[PDB]
Amino acid sequence: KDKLNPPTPSIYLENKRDAFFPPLHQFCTNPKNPVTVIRGLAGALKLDLGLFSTKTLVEANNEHMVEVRTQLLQPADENWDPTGTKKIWRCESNRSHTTIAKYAQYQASSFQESLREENEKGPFKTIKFGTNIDLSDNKKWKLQLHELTKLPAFARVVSAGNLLTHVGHTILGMNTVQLYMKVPGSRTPGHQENNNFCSVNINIGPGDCEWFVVPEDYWGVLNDFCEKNNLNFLMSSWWPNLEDLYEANVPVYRFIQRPGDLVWINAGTVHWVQAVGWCNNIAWNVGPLTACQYKLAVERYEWNKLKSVKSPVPMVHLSWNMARNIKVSDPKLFEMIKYCLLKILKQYQTLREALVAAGKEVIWHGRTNDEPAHYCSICEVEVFNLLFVTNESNTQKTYIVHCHDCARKTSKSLENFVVLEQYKMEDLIQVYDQFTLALSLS
Numbered sequence: 001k002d003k004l005n006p007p008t009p010s011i012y013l014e015n016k017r018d019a020f021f022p023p024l025h026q027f028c029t030n031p032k033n034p035v036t037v038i039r040g041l042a043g044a045l046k047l048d049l050g051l052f053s054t055k056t057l058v059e060a061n062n063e064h065m066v067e068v069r070t071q072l073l074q075p076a077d078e079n080w081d082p083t084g085t086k087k088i089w090r091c092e093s094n095r096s097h098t099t100i101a102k103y104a105q106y107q108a109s110s111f112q113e114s115l116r117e118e119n120e121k122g123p124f125k126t127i128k129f130g131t132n133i134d135l136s137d138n139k140k141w142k143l144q145l146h147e148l149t150k151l152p153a154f155a156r157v158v159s160a161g162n163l164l165t166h167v168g169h170t171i172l173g174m175n176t177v178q179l180y181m182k183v184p185g186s187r188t189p190g191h192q193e194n195n196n197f198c199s200v201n202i203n204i205g206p207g208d209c210e211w212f213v214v215p216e217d218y219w220g221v222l223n224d225f226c227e228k229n230n231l232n233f234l235m236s237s238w239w240p241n242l243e244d245l246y247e248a249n250v251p252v253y254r255f256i257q258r259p260g261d262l263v264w265i266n267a268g269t270v271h272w273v274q275a276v277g278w279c280n281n282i283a284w285n286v287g288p289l290t291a292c293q294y295k296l297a298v299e300r301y302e303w304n305k306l307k308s309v310k311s312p313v314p315m316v317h318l319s320w321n322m323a324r325n326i327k328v329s330d331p332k333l334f335e336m337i338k339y340c341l342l343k344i345l346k347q348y349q350t351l352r353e354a355l356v357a358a359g360k361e362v363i364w365h366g367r368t369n370d371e372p373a374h375y376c377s378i379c380e381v382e383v384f385n386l387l388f389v390t391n392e393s394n395t396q397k398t399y400i401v402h403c404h405d406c407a408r409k410t411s412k413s414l415e416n417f418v419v420l421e422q423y424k425m426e427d428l429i430q431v432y433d434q435f436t437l438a439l440s441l442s
C-alpha cells in the first residue's frame with residue numbers, strides 16, 4: 001500500500017520570519033503530524049553549528065565523559081543476526097565509557113581510514129557510537145547553550161510553555177541538552193521518548209542521519225513484536241524489520257536529516273535512527289501544553305509502573321506545579337489535570353486516614369525550596385507528600401525515601417518507619433480548589 005510509505009511532514013525555512021511564524025509551532029504540536037522535519041533551521045537563524053563541531057568540543061572539555069555503544073555496521077535499513085543468516089529485531093550494542101578527546105580521535109581516524117579504503121549477510125565490522133554526552137553545566141558549555149536560545153520559544157530547552165520547565169528541577173537529557181558523536185552506521189535503536197514527551201534533534205553535520213518513524217497509535221503493534229521476539233520494548237535494544245512492519249500494515253515514515261535540519265518528534269512517536277555519514281547531533285525534550293501531550297505522558301507514567309521501569313518525569317509533582325503556577329484554558333487539558341489531582345488527593349486522604357486510625361504518627365516535615373520529587377529507594381516509584389523513612393535514617397537525617405508498599409513489605413506494622421508529611425492537606429485542597437478553567441478566546 002502507498003499509505004504504508006507516507007510523505008514526511010516537512011517545513012522549509014528561509015529566514016528568521018519563517019522560524020518565528022506561529023503556524024510552524026502549531027504544525028509541530030498537531031497530533032496528526034507524528035514527526036516534523038524543519039529543514040534549513042540553522043541557516044534560517046544563522047545558528048553557529050561550529051560551536052558543536054568535534055574540534056570545538058575537544059577544545060572546550062576534552063576529558064568530558066562519553067557513553068560508548070559498540071555496535072555492528074549493518075547494511076542500509078536492515079539488522080542481521082551475527083551469522084548473516086536472517087534479519088532479526090535484537091540489536092547488539094555493548095556499553096562502555098570514554099572521553100570526548102578519545103572519541104574525537106576515533107571519529108577522525110575512522111574517516112581518514114575510509115578515505116584510504118576508497119582509494120585502495122556478513123561478516124560485519126564493529127563501530128563505536130558516542131552517546132548521551134551531558135551538556136547541562138552552563139559553566140562548561142556557556143557559548144553552546146547560549147546559541148540554542150536563538151531558537152523559537154516552542155523549541156527551546158527552557159520556556160514558559162514547556163511542561164519540563166514547570167517540573168522545577170533538572171531531568172538530565174530532557175530539560176538539559178544531550179550531545180551525540182557519530183560515525184557511519186551509529187544506531188539509536190527503537191524507542192519512545194521518556195514518558196512520551198516531544199523531542200528536538202539538530203544535526204550538526206557534516207554528514208547526514210536517516211530516520212525511521214512510526215505513529216504513536218501503532219506502538220502496541222511494535223510492543224507485540226518485541227514480546228514475540230523475546231525483547232523488552234522499553235529496555236531492550238531493537239531494530240524493526242521493515243518487511244515485518246509492512247506485513248503488519250504499519251506505516252513507516254522515512255527521511256534524511258541534513259546538517260542544520262531540526263527534527264521534531266511528536267509525543268509518543270516511535271522511532272529509530274542511524275548515521276549515514278560522520279556527524280554530531282544535539283537533542284533534548286519539550287512538553288507542549290496540550291491535552292495530547294499530558295494524556296500520553298500520564299499513560300506512559302502508569303505503564304512504566306506495571307513494567308517496573310522508572311519514570312524520569314515525576315508526573316504527580318508536575319501536575320501539582322501546573323495547578324499551582326499555570327493558567328490552563330484548554331477545557332480538555334484542564335479536565336485531565338483536574339481529574340489526576342483529584343485521584344492523588346483521594347489516595348493521599350485514604351492512606352493518611354488509614355495510618356491515623358492504626359495509631360501511626362504523621363510527622364510534619366515540610367519541604368525545601370526547589371526540592372525535587374521523590375522516588376522509592378527500592379522500587380523507584382514516585383512518592384508524593386507522605387514519605388516512609390526508617391527510624392534510623394530519620395535519626396541520621398539522611399531521610400532515605402520509601403513508598404508505603406515497600407515500607408510495609410519490610411516492616412509489617414511500620415514499626416521500623418516514621419511517616420513524614422511534606423504538605424498540609426489544607427494546602428493541597430486549596431491548590432485544587434483554586435485550580436479552575438481560565439478563559440482564552442484563542
Ligand SMILES: O=C(O)C1CCNCC1
Binds near residue numbers: 180187
Ligand atoms: O541522533 C540520535 O542518535 C537520536 C535520535 C533520536 N533519539 C535519540 C537519539
Ligand SMILES: [Mn+2]
Binds near residue numbers: 191192193199265
Ligand atoms: Mn529519541
Ligand SMILES: [Zn+2]
Binds near residue numbers: 377402
Ligand atoms: Zn517502593
